[PDB]
Design a binder for this molecule. Structure first.
Ligand SMILES: CC(=O)O[C@H]1C(=O)[C@@]2(C)[C@H]([C@H](OC(=O)c3ccccc3)[C@]3(O)C[C@H](OC(=O)[C@H](O)[C@@H](NC(=O)c4ccccc4)c4ccccc4)C(C)=C1C3(C)C)[C@]1(OC(C)=O)CO[C@@H]1C[C@@H]2O
Ligand SMILES: Nc1nc2c(ncn2[C@@H]2O[C@H](COP(=O)(O)OP(=O)(O)OP(=O)(O)O)[C@@H](O)[C@H]2O)c(=O)[nH]1
Ligand SMILES: Nc1ncnc2c1ncn2[C@@H]1O[C@H](COP(=O)(O)OP(=O)(O)NP(=O)(O)O)[C@@H](O)[C@H]1O
Ligand SMILES: Nc1nc2c(ncn2[C@@H]2O[C@H](COP(=O)(O)OP(=O)(O)O)[C@@H](O)[C@H]2O)c(=O)[nH]1
Ligand SMILES: [Mg+2]
Lengths: 426, 412, 300
């Protein structure tokens, strides 16, 4: 059940550095150390993300692709930056400009060939590979552009494998990039046409959660990304170990994606409280459901109330009663039946892992595919056409090699998804 | 004489190990002792490895432990077309070696969960080869029925309906147990709010032990495996009889213990204790096998059966003048030293097929149609190598079962 | 709306099949538009539009079905003819045929070129193997080719980086097909012949499709991949039916599902009229495949 992890762009690089900074403790592996885990059950599943090398040195099978050498270098000279092998370092010292076309056609394609060689080597390692996890930005050049081509080629090479993408969408309230909507519409195009699973993470969403739920007066990127790197563990690592009810990407996709349109899922975290102040330890069963199914606990700007739940995944981890979990789920599906879909008897596919997140007793990862994400699409598309009508920043793409019709096509397929989402919403 | 068990799917392996744990417990065999005639088959590597690290690690041979290193998922299509045809040959190979090992075998004891991936697709193609290469053998499967309301998977009916579609023309008799009903028994009778999966397996295994294990032992009135189907399924269809256990008293709160034959027998006709959600709404009893194990008097059984027949409340089929199979074992009902059973000196195992099965199937049938109307996650099946014909034709085929019970039953 | 014309054709019984077994025709030809189905028994009625028996020659199929298309090319409208049906039903025989009796495709060229004030025609022939588009006109045999479908402001899908050739006579296009048949690969390749005539301008593009059949008897995921393509095709056609019926039904179509349905978007729902060709086999053992195609076509 081995999987390869790929970091694309500044956003992907930064998040990847945090992910491998968290999962390292989950598996119990030091930067260049061996298995220093507390338990020994974690060792039996280290082959999912690590490649057996010098015995002591467990090398993570992650491919980091960036156009900004400085950005990638800051990771290499950081905490868990030496843990990666130089062979997996795909840096493109070319025109690192925030432009989808530039990072796809111009300076993108040239580096893609080099990336393909590395990824093909990582996939053809040992045993049987399951899929390819990717982390990128939606309003960037390397993240939205290069990453998009990476997935396009990967799905072409291994259509038998699944793809799980983690993408941070453009902040609706305060966009971090000027040409953000321009890159977003283009990146989301290849996403729906290529990847099978995708999790959306909002900028201000993390801010709000780290403000109301968590008492963090200064939620820097290192703080926000940390939370994101905790959700992915429940979707990946947590689904690698044994439990009362095991699940995986196959189990998830088949019980989450109702159509061949990918569908964007919204992530959440059950054990979300402060350090000592909120140390109530209220993590039995109903408290988790109350947290996971919270309109202000979603890592996305779109709230669950602005739509209906198409399919929900419950990835629990720790010792608990199966009957208690499922019983509580029924309660939620009954109380919130109005927006829990009426064309599917059971929309929640329960799953319970037998191992908690180290220093945590009770935990659960929330994965919900709801039509509420439709609001996000309409929001991004709105901003796109607003500037596309004027073609203000069009020349930045035209000079690279971007078709006029390409831009309109990306939006037309995106709008297509919005239209179909509503069909299942009613 | 002997019977080979085939546990397919996660639940199949879990229940199989728990069932066999009880099997050797009463046999008086320790972890490191004979060779069990059973194999574990699952595409999920983590499930099979549980027996390789947990209890009875040195009791089973690696040859009896088929393990896939790929992904099974929860889709019938995968375990039937995609990866199913990759391990099936190896599975058949092992069960064939075991079949030849035993001199004059009776049949196979299948164990699986209707709601799953390996427990659905794998079972379907496995039984397919069994009915062709071992048509002269008794095919008795123990199918775990998904909960009517507390479903475990979203594509639950999608996998279950297809499994029973093909297996209906393969297995001679399939003993179905309701997942949710086990919880009911643990709540009302066992009186516990902590009914773990492993706790459910304790009850199901207790039934199997009395259906095969003790019944294979020289008692007072043994019932052969062939006799089972001969007196359970009056039609050449894979009908599904219920599994009821009389002693459901918990060894803690209630402590009657000394219960007469009349009471134990009467405790197998109540909806509160049937191990199935097929409540006696209007279901007529066509064939009921009563396996008594322990200190029981034949005359006491005859009297208990007679009084029930004249109860009238328990309506039998019009064309069924006498539908009671009397089974008498000399081996008492053993109980796990650390379980939740009170341990009685006599147990009654009731296994009967009623028209109530149609009601249960109708619920799942509707569940399939509901999602099928919009196809739902059909792509996760079609892309595996299944056409609409594997769904539409199955839909009609399974629908014939609702009509089957409707004709076999109800009509005078 | 227009309706996709529906045509059914059954394979004839030769001395070979007669020698092997009865091979009784389960499908009876009732009227030129409908069919009575008695399959050893099952009763069903096929209401297509046009149906020809095993007696008619290969030219006969083209004479009625393909002739109406030849007229539309002059009209300026695009047309797509796709041959669908069970395995080894003779679809390739009906579409290509032989030198003596040419199929709908070769005969189409004969009539269209005969019909063709200056006229111009572009010829394109390619094979789609494993969802890969391979040009039969230029390359020798089975490399990834660099082409995508872009969607213009008109909403019409266009395949980019396609090969185009100018042909004077019909034999020139026929010769190109010979090359395509020679370079052709097969499954364990979709052959699509595209003909675009310029009326001088009004341009009409025609395309022929003939599904090769891979049925498993008891590459990478070739079975599952296409299985999905046929699945979306069936669902898309179903949506096309309800939306064309015109009570008031706006349903979104799963065109994005597979690349196949995506590429043929312009032919079905876009600028172009299409014809449905259903070739079936009278054999009783083949009824399994027939049952699906029957239900798919006729509504029971
Ligand atoms: C004394 C004690 O019990 O401390 C707890 C703690 O106080 C709390 C507040 C932790 C704490 O988490 C945060 O404050 C936090 C900071 C940035 C972003 C997100 C969260 C904690 O830092 C996080 C830490 O989490 C873990 O150890 C998990 O294994 C977690 N690990 C990481 O995220 C990680 C952090 C640094 C380095 C490597 C990994 C994990 C979760 C899911 C999947 C895999 C791993 C825990 C329980 C605590 C501290 C240490 C204070 C909480 O978070 C988690 C993810 O458990 C925040 O609300 C929960 C509730 C916990 O009780
Ligand atoms: N009684 C009981 N029911 C169980 C147990 N484990 C799972 N189930 C039930 O069986 C179904 C779960 O099947 P899965 O575990 O998803 O799948 P599987 O049948 O093992 O096969 P795959 O889908 O390929 O993994 C649900 O309805 C669960 O409620 C168990 O230990 N005991
Ligand atoms: N009308 C016909 N007269 C004589 N031979 C025919 C006729 N129809 C089909 N055949 C022959 O029967 C076989 C079916 O041919 P084709 O090869 O036409 O099948 P499909 O194209 O039906 N098969 P497939 O592509 O594998 O799915 C070939 O050997 C044909 O030459
Ligand atoms: N959560 C999160 N977002 C980030 C990080 N870095 C950049 N972003 C977001 O990514 C977008 C900018 O794209 P960027 O990553 O610079 O693109 P690229 O580097 O050219 O591929 C903005 O919306 C930022 O909020 C990060 O470390 N964590
Ligand atoms: Mg399993």
């Amino acid at each position: 059940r081995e999987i390869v992890h790929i970091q694309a762009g500044q956003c992907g690089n930064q998040i990847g550095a945090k992910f491998w900074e968290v999962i390292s403790d989950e598996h119990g592996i030091d930067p260049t150390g061996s298995y220093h885990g507390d338990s020994d059950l974690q060792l039996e599943r280290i082959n999912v993300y690590y490649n057996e090398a010098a015995g002591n040195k467990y090398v993570p099978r992650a491919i980091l692709v960036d156009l900004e050498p400085g950005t990638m270098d800051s990771v290499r000279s950081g905490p868990f930056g030496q843990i990666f092998r130089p062979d997996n370092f795909v840096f493109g010292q070319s025109g690192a400009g925030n432009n989808w076309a530039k990072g796809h056609y111009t300076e993108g394609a040239e580096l893609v060939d080099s990336v393909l060689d590395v990824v093909r080597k990582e996939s053809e390692s040992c045993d049987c590979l399951q899929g390819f996890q990717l982390t990128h930005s939606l309003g960037g050049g390397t993240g939205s552009g290069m990453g998009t081509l990476l997935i396009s080629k990967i799905r072409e090479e291994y259509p038998d494998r699944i793809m799980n993408t983690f993408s941070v969408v453009p902040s609706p309230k305060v966009s971090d990039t000027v040409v953000e909507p321009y890159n977003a519409t283009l990146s989301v195009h290849q996403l729906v046409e290529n990847t099978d699973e995708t999790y959306c993470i909002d900028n201000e969403a993390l801010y709000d959660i780290c403000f109301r739920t968590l008492k963090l007066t200064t939620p820097t990127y290192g703080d926000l990304n940390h939370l994101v790197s905790a959700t992915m563990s429940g979707v990946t690592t947590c689904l690698r170990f044994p439990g009362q009810l095991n699940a995986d990407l196959r189990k998830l996709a088949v019980n989450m994606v109702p159509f061949p349109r990918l569908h964007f899922f919204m992530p959440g975290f059950a054990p979300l409280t402060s350090r000592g102040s909120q140390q109530y330890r209220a993590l039995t069963v109903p408290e988790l459901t109350q947290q996971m199914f919270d309109a202000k606990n979603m890592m996305a700007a779109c709230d669950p109330r602005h739509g209906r739940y198409l399919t929900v995944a419950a990835v629990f981890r720790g010792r608990m009663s199966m009957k208690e979990v499922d019983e509580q789920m029924l309660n939620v599906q009954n109380k919130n039946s109005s927006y829990f879909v009426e064309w599917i008897p059971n929309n929640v596919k329960t799953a319970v892992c037998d191992i908690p997140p180290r220093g945590l007793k009770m935990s659960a990862t929330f994965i919900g595919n709801s039509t509420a994400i439709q609001e996000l699409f309409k929001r991004i598309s709105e901003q796109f056409t607003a500037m596309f009508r004027r073609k203000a920043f069009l020349h930045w793409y035209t000079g690279e090699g971007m078709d006029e019709m390409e831009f309109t096509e990306a939006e037309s397929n995106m709008n297509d998804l919005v239209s179909e989402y509503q069909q299942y919403q009613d | 004489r002997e019977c080979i068990s085939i546990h397919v799917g996660q639940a199949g392996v879990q229940i199989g190990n728990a069932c066999w744990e009880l099997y050797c417990l009463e046999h008086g065999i320790q972890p490191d002792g004979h060779v069990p005639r059973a194999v574990f088959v699952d595409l999920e590597p983590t499930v099979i490895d549980e027996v390789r690290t947990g209890t009875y690690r040195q009791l089973f041979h690696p040859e009896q432990l088929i393990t896939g290193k790929e992904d099974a998922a929860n889709n019938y299509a995968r375990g039937h077309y995609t990866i199913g045809k990759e391990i099936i040959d190896l599975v058949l190979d092992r069960i064939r070696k075991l079949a030849d090992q035993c001199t004059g075998l009776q049949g196979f004891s299948v164990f699986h969960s209707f709601g799953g991936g390996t427990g659905s697709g794998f079972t379907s193609l496995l039984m397919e080869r069994l009915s062709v290469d071992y048509g002269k053998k008794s095919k008795l499967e123990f199918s775990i029925y998904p909960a009517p309301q507390v479903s475990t998977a979203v594509v639950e009916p999608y996998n279950s309906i297809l499994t029973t579609h093909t297996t209906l023309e393969h297995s001679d008799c399939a003993f179905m147990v309701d997942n949710e009903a086990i919880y009911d028994i643990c709540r009302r009778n066992l009186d516990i709010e902590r009914p773990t999966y492993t706790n459910l397996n304790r009850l199901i295994g207790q039934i199997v032990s009395s259906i095969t294990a003790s019944l294979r032992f020289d008692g007072a009135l043994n019932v052969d495996l062939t006799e089972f189907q001969t007196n359970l399924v009056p039609y050449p269809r894979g009908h599904f009889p219920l599994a009821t256990y009389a002693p459901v008293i918990s060894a803690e709160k209630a402590y009657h213990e000394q219960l007469s034959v009349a009471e134990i027998t009467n405790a197998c006709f109540e909806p509160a204790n049937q191990m199935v959600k097929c409540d006696p709404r209007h279901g007529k009893y066509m064939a009921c096998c009563l396996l008594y194990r322990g200190d029981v008097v034949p005359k006491d059984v005859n009297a208990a059966i007679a009084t029930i027949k004249t109860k009238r409340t328990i309506q039998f089929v019009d064309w069924c003048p006498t539908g009671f199979k009397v089974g008498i074992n000399y081996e008492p009902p053993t109980v796990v030293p650390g379980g939740d059973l009170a341990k009685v000196q006599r147990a009654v195992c009731m296994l009967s097929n009623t028209t109530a099965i149609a009601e249960a199937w109708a619920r799942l049938d509707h569940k399939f149609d509901l999602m099928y109307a919009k196809r739902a996650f059909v792509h996760w099946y079609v892309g595996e190598g299944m056409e609409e014909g594997e769904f539409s034709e199955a839909r009609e085929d399974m629908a014939a079962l609702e009509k089957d019970y409707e004709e076999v039953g109800v009509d005078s | 709306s227009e309706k996709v014309k529906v045509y059914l054709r059954i394979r004839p019984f030769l001395t070979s099949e007669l020698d092997r077994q009865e091979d009784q025709g389960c499908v009876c030809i009732e009227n030129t538009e409908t069919l009575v189905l008695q399959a050893p028994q099952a009763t069903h009625k096929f209401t297509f539009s046009q149906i020809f028996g095993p007696e008619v020659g290969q030219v006969a199929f083209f004479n009625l079905t393909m002739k109406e298309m030849v007229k539309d090319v002059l009209k300026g409208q695009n047309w797509l003819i796709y041959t669908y049906g069970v395995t080894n039903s003779g679809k390739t025989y009906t579409i290509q045929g032989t030198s003596k009796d040419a199929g709908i495709l070769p005969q189409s060229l004969a009539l269209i070129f005969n019909s063709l004030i200056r006229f111009s025609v572009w010829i394109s022939f390619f094979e789609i193997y494993n969802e890969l588009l391979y040009d039969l006109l230029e390359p020798p045999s089975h490399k990834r080719q660099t082409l995508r479908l872009c969607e213009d402001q008109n909403g019409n899908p266009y395949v980019k980086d396609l090969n185009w050739i100018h042909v004077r006579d019909v034999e020139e296009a026929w010769k190109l097909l010979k090359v395509g048949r020679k370079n052709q690969s097969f499954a364990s390749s979709h052959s699509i012949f595209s003909i675009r005539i310029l009326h001088l301008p009004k341009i009409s593009e025609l395309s022929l499709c003939d599904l090769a059949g891979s049925e498993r008897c008891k590459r990478l995921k070739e079975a599952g991949n296409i299985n999905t393509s046929l699945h979306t095709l069936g669902r898309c056609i179903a949506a096309l039916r309800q939306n064309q019926q015109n009570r008031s039904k706006q349903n979104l179509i799963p065109f994005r599902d597979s690349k196949l349905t995506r590429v043929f978007q312009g032919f079905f729902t876009g600028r172009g009229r299409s014809c449905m060709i259903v070739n079936v086999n009278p054999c009783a053992s083949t009824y399994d495949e027939t049952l699906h195609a029957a239900k798919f076509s006729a509504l029971a």
